[PDB]
Amino acid sequence: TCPFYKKIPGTGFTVDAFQYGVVEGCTAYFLTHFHSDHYAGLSKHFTFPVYCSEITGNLLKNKLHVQEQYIHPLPLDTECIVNGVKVVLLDANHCPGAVMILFYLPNGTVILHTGDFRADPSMERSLLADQKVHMLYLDTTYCSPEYTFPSQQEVIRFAINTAFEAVTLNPHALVVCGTYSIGKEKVFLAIADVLGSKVGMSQEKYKTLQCLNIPEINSLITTDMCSSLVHLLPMMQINFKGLQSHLKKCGGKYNQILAFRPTGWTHSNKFTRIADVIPQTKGNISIYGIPYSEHSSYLEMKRFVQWLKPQKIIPTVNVGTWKSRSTMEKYFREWKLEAGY
Numbered sequence: 001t002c003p004f005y006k007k008i009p010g011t012g013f014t015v016d017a018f019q020y021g022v023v024e025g026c027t028a029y030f031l032t033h034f035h036s037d038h039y040a041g042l043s044k045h046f047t048f049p050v051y052c053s054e055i056t057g058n059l060l061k062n063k064l065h066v067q068e069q070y071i072h073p074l075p076l077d078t079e080c081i082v083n084g085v086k087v088v089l090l091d092a093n094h095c096p097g098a099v100m101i102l103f104y105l106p107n108g109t110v111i112l113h114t115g116d117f118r119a120d121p122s123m124e125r126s127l128l129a130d131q132k133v134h135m136l137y138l139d140t141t142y143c144s145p146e147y148t149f150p151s152q153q154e155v156i157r158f159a160i161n162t163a164f165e166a167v168t169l170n171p172h173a174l175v176v177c178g179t180y181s182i183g184k185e186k187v188f189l190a191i192a193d194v195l196g197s198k199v200g201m202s203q204e205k206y207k208t209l210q211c212l213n214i215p216e217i218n219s220l221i222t223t224d225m226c227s228s229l230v231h232l233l234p235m236m237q238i239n240f241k242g243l244q245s246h247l248k249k250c251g252g253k254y255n256q257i258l259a260f261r262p263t264g265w266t267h268s269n270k271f272t273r274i275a276d277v278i279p280q281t282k283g284n285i286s287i288y289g290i291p292y293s294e295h296s297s298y299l300e301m302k303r304f305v306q307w308l309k310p311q312k313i314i315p316t317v318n319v320g321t322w323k324s325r326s327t328m329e330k331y332f333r334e335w336k337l338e339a340g341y
C-alpha cells in the first residue's frame with residue numbers, strides 16, 4: 001500500500017506515488033522528476049491529473065505517451081493554486097526538470113518536499129528565504145558522514161583534461177560515456193565541446209535529450225555515429241567485452257577507447273582525491289569511474305537542514321531498515337542540538 005511518507009496531510013495530494021493503483025482520496029498526483037523509481041506505474045492509460053515541471057511534462061507526453069489532457073505543467077518560482085491549495089515548484093539541482101515542492105496548507109502549516117536534490121547554498125536565496133517551514137520530506141540517500149564527494153565543477157574539469165590529453169596524443173582514440181537515465185548530461189557535453197565533436201547516440205536517447213529544453217541542443221548532439229568521436233552507450237555495455245565489441249563496430253576508424261562511468265558514491269572516495277583517480281585498463285581500453293553526484297553529500301545536506309530549521313523531518317530514502325532509520329534520526333538530533341532549533 002502507499003507509504004505514509006508519499007502522502008501530504010491535509011490535502012488530497014500524493015508525491016511520486018504511481019504504482020499503487022487508485023490511491024483512496026487522492027485528487028492530484030505530483031511527479032518530482034523523470035526517474036523510473038519515481039514515475040513507476042505511469043502510462044498512456046492514466047486518467048488522473050499529474051502536476052510537474054514543463055520538462056517532466058515533455059518526457060511524459062513523448063516517452064510514456066501520457067495523454068495531454070492529464071498533464072499539468074507549472075512554471076518554477078511562481079505561486080500557483082492547485083485544487084484550492086497554494087504551491088510553488090523550485091529547482092532541485094538534480095536531473096533536468098527535477099523540482100522540490102512547497103505546499104501552503106489551509107491550516108497555516110508549510111511543507112517542503114525535496115524530491116531528489118543536491119543541496120546548494122543558492123537555495124538559501126530562493127523563495128524559501130521568505131517564510132518558515134514546519135515539515136521537511138527529505139532526500140536522505142547519502143545521510144552518513146562517510147559520504148564525501150567533490151564538486152560537480154571539479155569532476156568535469158578532470159574529465160575534460162583527461163579526454164583532451166588522450167585524443168591529442170592519439171587522434172584515433174574514441175571516447176565513450178555510459179548512461180541509463182536522464183541526468184549528468186554535463187559529463188558528455190563538456191567532453192564533446194573540448195574535442196569539437198557532436199555527441200553521437202541512439203535514436204531513443206536522442207529523442208529523450210530533445211525534450212529537455214537545453215539551449216542550442218541541435219548543435220551539440222547527433223544520431224550519426226560515424227561523424228562523431230564521443231559515443232553514448234547503455235551503462236550496461238561499459239565494460240571490456242561490451243567496449244571491444246563496440247570497437248569492432250566502428251570499422252577500423254579507431255584503435256583505442258577511453259570510457260567514463262559516472263557513478264554515484266563509491267568507497268575509493270573515502271581514500272582518494274579526484275586529482276589522483278586512475279582507470280582500469282585492458283589492452284587498448286581504459287575505463288574511468290568518476291564520482292559525479294546529483295544527490296547531496298552528508299555535509300551539504302547538513303548545511304541545508306541547519307539553515308532551514310524544520311520542526312519535523314520525514315526521510316524518503318533508506319527507510320526500509322530499522323538500522324538505517326535509527327542512524328538517520330540520530331544525525332537529525334545531533335544537527336538540531338548543535339544549531340539550537
Ligand code: NI
Pocket residue numbers: 033035094116
Ligand atoms: Ni532521481
